[PDB]
Write a protein that binds this ligand. Structure first.
Ligand SMILES: [K+]
Ligand SMILES: [K+]
Ligand SMILES: [K+]
Ligand SMILES: [Mg+2]
Ligand SMILES: [Mg+2]
Length: 136
RNA sequence: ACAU
DNA sequence: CGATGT
């Protein structure tokens, strides 16, 4: 089982969990940063991993790219497959922004199609995903 | 247990 | 050491 180098890798970064959430997508081969989301003041790790995949799908579709996406998040891969982010984060005024983005990402999934394979990055075999923030 |  | 998730 080998890395598919012609791919997009995504990952969340956070300050606290729940805490400040950001995410980015990179070229798996070169590490070039292709997109980065502006920090969101409160969210969870899994909400951010979910948003990163959905943004990757939107990014690749806009560019007519058939590359797969790698994520290290078992949870977020499932949530994208299900088109449903099963987060436990409370809804209040401080979490309104992240929940709006997650709701809108689900809505996009329910109104668009894609063939993009969403693949598990095998951290145990390959080390940290290329989009990692280097914070652990 | 597994993945973050 | 704590949290988010299956
Ligand atoms: K990891
Ligand atoms: K990190
Ligand atoms: K646990
Ligand atoms: Mg990750
Ligand atoms: Mg990471």
């Amino acid at each position: 089982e080998e890395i598919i180098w012609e791919s997009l890798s995504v990952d969340v970064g956070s300050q606290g969990n729940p805490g400040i959430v950001e995410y980015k997508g990179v070229d798996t081969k070169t590490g070039e940063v292709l997109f980065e989301r502006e920090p969101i003041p409160i969210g969870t790790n899994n909400m951010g991993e979910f948003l990163a995949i959905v943004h990757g799908l939107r990014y690749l579709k806009e560019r007519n790219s058939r590359k797969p996406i790698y994520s290290d998040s078992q949870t977020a891969i499932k949530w994208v497959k299900d088109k449903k982010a099963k987060s436990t984060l409370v809804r209040n005024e401080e979490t309104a922004l992240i929940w709006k983005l997650v709701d809108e990402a689900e809505e996009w999934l329910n109104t668009h199609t894609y063939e993009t394979p969403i693949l598990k990055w095998q951290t145990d075999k390959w080390g940290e995903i290329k989009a990692d923030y280097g914070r652990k």
